[PDB]
Amino acid sequence: AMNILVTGGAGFIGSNFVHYMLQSYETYKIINFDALTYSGNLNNVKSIQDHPNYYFVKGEIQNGELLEHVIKERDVQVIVNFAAESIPFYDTNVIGTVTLLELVKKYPHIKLVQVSTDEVYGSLGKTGRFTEETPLAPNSPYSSSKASADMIALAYYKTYQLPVIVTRCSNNYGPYQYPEKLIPLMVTNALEGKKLPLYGDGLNVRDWLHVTDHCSAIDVVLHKGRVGEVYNIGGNNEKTNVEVVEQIITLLGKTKKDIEYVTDGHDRRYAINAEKMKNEFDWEPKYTFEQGLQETVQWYEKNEEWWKPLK
Amino acid sequence: AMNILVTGGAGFIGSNFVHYMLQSYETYKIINFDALTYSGNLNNVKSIQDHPNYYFVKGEIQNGELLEHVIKERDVQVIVNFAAESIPFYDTNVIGTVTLLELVKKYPHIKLVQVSTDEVYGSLGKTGRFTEETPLAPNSPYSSSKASADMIALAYYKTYQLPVIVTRCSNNYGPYQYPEKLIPLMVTNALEGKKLPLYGDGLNVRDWLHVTDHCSAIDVVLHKGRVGEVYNIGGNNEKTNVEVVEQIITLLGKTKKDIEYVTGHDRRYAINAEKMKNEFDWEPKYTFEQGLQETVQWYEKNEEWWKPLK
Numbered sequence: 001a002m003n004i005l006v007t008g009g010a011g012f013i014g015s016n017f018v019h020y021m022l023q024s025y026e027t028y029k030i031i032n033f034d035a036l037t038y039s040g041n042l043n044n045v046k047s048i049q050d051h052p053n054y055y056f057v058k059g060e061i062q063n064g065e066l067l068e069h070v071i072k073e074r075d076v077q078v079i080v081n082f083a084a085e086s087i088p089f090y091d092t093n094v095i096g097t098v099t100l101l102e103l104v105k106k107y108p109h110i111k112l113v114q115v116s117t118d119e120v121y122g123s124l125g126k127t128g129r130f131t132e133e134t135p136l137a138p139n140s141p142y143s144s145s146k147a148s149a150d151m152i153a154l155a156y157y158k159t160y161q162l163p164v165i166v167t168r169c170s171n172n173y174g175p176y177q178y179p180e181k182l183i184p185l186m187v188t189n190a191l192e193g194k195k196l197p198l199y200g201d202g203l204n205v206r207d208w209l210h211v212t213d214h215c216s217a218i219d220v221v222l223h224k225g226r227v228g229e230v231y232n233i234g235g236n237n238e239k240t241n242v243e244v245v246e247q248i249i250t251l252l253g254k255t256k257k258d259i260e261y262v263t264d265g266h267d268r269r270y271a272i273n274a275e276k277m278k279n280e281f282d283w284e285p286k287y288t289f290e291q292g293l294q295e296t297v298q299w300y301e302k303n304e305e306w307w308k309p310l311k
Numbered sequence: 312a313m314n315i316l317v318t319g320g321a322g323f324i325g326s327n328f329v330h331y332m333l334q335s336y337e338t339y340k341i342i343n344f345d346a347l348t349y350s351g352n353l354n355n356v357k358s359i360q361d362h363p364n365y366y367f368v369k370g371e372i373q374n375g376e377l378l379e380h381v382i383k384e385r386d387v388q389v390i391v392n393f394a395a396e397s398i399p400f401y402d403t404n405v406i407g408t409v410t411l412l413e414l415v416k417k418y419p420h421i422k423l424v425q426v427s428t429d430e431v432y433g434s435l436g437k438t439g440r441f442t443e444e445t446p447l448a449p450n451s452p453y454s455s456s457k458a459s460a461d462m463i464a465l466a467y468y469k470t471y472q473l474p475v476i477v478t479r480c481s482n483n484y485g486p487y488q489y490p491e492k493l494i495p496l497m498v499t500n501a502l503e504g505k506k507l508p509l510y511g512d513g514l515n516v517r518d519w520l521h522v523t524d525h526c527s528a529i530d531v532v533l534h535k536g537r538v539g540e541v542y543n544i545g546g547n548n549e550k551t552n553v554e555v556v557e558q559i560i561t562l563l564g565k566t567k568k569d570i571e572y573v574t575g576h577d578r579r580y581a582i583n584a585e586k587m588k589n590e591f592d593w594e595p596k597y598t599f600e601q602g603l604q605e606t607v608q609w610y611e612k613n614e615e616w617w618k619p620l621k
């Protein structure tokens with residue numbers, strides 16, 4: 001029944017989302033629109049590349065002509081914007097978003113889900129959790145670029161009533177995450193017999209959300225989410241980086257002697273309260289961290305062909 | 312002693328600032344860097360265009376190569392960024408700011424004062440005033456572009472300790488404001504024997520700051536302002552649009568019979584500037600009654616300036 005444009009769909013979360021939608025909705029058309037930057041990888045999507053309902057488009061979200069063309073042609077009804085970079089950093093994160101908003105402004109029947117991050121709220125103290133009313137206070141170029149796109153997106157809603165929704169999630173983990181990222185780094189280093197580094201003092205705290213739970217959250221927001229709102233999405237947990245490493249160590253029968261301390265800045269604590277998702281759609285994460293972590297570790301053990309070339 | 316780059320210096324506030332600094336500091340060099348868009352007007356600065364300490368540069372703040380060149384060459388020490396637009400809207404307001412931050416990152420001795428607006432906080436209810444801890448909640452494309460540049464600017468401070476300061480002020484009024492803007496529109500229409508329009512129901516509330524008080528605030532921040540901080544700047548008043556028109560009407564001996572109703576905009580803006588007060592003992596020197604009167608006179612005396620723009 002629906003046609004969905006997934007920008008950044010060759011990336012980590014994006015690819016996972018593309019798979020999730022195709023498996024969950026046998027009649028939806030999924031258009032993966034991706035610029036294939038360093039973090040974009042077509043291998044993430046090679047299993048469904050010949051699926052009759054999948055379409056790939058190589059391009060930048062800043063390319064309005066191409067976007068219009070794809071939109072008219074595929075009769076697009078929803079746009080989920082995962083496309084982002086981690087100077088043309090702002091071009092993609094801010095200006096790319098603006099380009100999408102202008103398209104929606106011209107085709108106001110098209111719903112836009114701007115996928116954002118909890119880093120937008122800055123760091124928490126020892127206690128407390130972010131809510132959708134927590135004020136924005138980004139500390140990095142990346143998080144500031146992300147917050148900027150959010151505020152701009154919501155201003156388009158308040159100014160022209162465009163069907164725009166913003167989601168803010170905690171740290172994702174799962175299959176297809178590049179090996180530079182914490183969990184894969186720890187796992188793949190362990191598999192390669194290397195030291196497991198901990199930046200800082202290892203006590204930074206994060207809320208770990210399994211990628212597919214993020215995908216199911218977006219699926220809900222996309223379908224039943226109220227236009228103009230923000231929705232925090234989290235894994236209902238909170239872990240120090242060192243706890244995460246210790247769990248990975250145990251899962252691979254390694255010892256703590258493999259850990260090593262290094263220096264770096266990074267925010268001290270992130271933790272998301274997702275009661276709004278819960279109250280409004282009765283949504284909760286399906287995975288516990290213990291369960292997610294284990295499957296993820298296995299995935300990396302079983303997929304050296306995928307991560308070796310990226311390391 | 313100092314060399315200051317004023318971006319957007321051919322505009323309303325920018326030009327006023329250029330004049331204010333040249334008159335206040337006989338040994339400072341002021342470099343007006345402006346792209347001369349629709350709202351840029353070299354007549355705003357023609358009286359000081361031959362001043363030995365003034366320099367003009369035509370260019371966009373997105374032009375990093377040009378900026379670097381000007382910086383190296385004029386041995387710039389401070390940058391005050393007034394440049395802004397009211398799609399390449401974001402290019403100038405966000406990306407232009409990023410371009411300036413990158414340059415500061417490369418020349419971290421250069422202080423940057425990012426000039427922002429109270430529209431960044433969104434609208435207030437019936438009571439209360441904005442503080443520097445009021446959360447951001449912009450409602451328009453313009454205010455969202457402005458807030459974006461602020462958050463980005465402060466993130467550069469938190470991430471690399473760059474000497475960046477953000478100021479947020481209320482509605483400016485005064486000499487060299489285009490005749491499309493409320494006060495000039497009312498005044499210039501009255502002078503031309505036209506109806507004085509009130510958009511909406513005339514009850515939108517604003518805090519009116521005289522442009523030279525804004526300039527003096529920036530002068531203080533520039534010199535004594537703490538890096539990484541935000542400073543709210545306001546006129547310590549609050550007026551409905553209709554009150555403003557009534558005052559203009561009495562100042563020109565017109566009657567209310569000249570007002571006319573027409574028809575989105577935020578409901579109420581009001582700034583609390585106690586931080587400026589506590590930290591630098593700064594207050595606006597103008598009262599609205601005083602500022603409004605001088606402004607009205609200015610428009611009466613400068614038809615040569617506003618006629619071509621109307």
Ligand SMILES: NC(=O)c1ccc[n+]([C@@H]2O[C@H](COP(=O)([O-])OP(=O)(O)OC[C@H]3O[C@@H](n4cnc5c(N)ncnc54)[C@H](O)[C@@H]3O)[C@@H](O)[C@H]2O)c1
Nearest residue numbers: 008010011012013035036037039040060061083084117172
């Ligand atoms: N830990 C996390 O991964 C996390 C946390 C919170 C929020 N999210 C957010 O979700 C989104 C997806 O994150 P991710 O981890 O999949 O990152 P990723 O780096 O894997 O995804 C980026 C994808 O977008 C593509 N891309 C980059 N610039 C583009 C452009 N201008 N036009 C079109 N495509 C472009 C890349 O080629 C790649 O395919 C981001 O907006 C991110 O901020 C992620």
Ligand SMILES: NC(=O)c1ccc[n+]([C@@H]2O[C@H](COP(=O)([O-])OP(=O)(O)OC[C@H]3O[C@@H](n4cnc5c(N)ncnc54)[C@H](O)[C@@H]3O)[C@@H](O)[C@H]2O)c1
Nearest residue numbers: 319321322323324346347348350351371372394395428483
């Ligand atoms: N009531 C107000 O006017 C008010 C209130 C609060 C904050 N401010 C802020 O103060 C600043 C100046 O306001 P104003 O009303 O005096 O401005 P204005 O529109 O009169 O002046 C804008 C100036 O900037 C220049 N400019 C535009 N794009 C440029 C670019 N890419 N590169 C270089 N220069 C460029 C224009 O040529 C023009 O001379 C803005 O940043 C605005 O956001 C204004």
Ligand SMILES: OC[C@H]1O[C@@](CO)(O[C@H]2O[C@H](CO)[C@@H](O)[C@H](O)[C@H]2O)[C@@H](O)[C@@H]1O
Nearest residue numbers: 370371372373374375376377378402410
């Ligand atoms: O390296 C150029 C650099 O400057 C900018 C500023 O707008 O553009 C300049 O250079 C353009 C092409 O190189 C010219 O079209 C233009 O004259 C000039 O503004 C940036 O866009 C770019 O990063």
Ligand code: NI
Nearest residue numbers: 069070073074
């Ligand atoms: Ni086509």
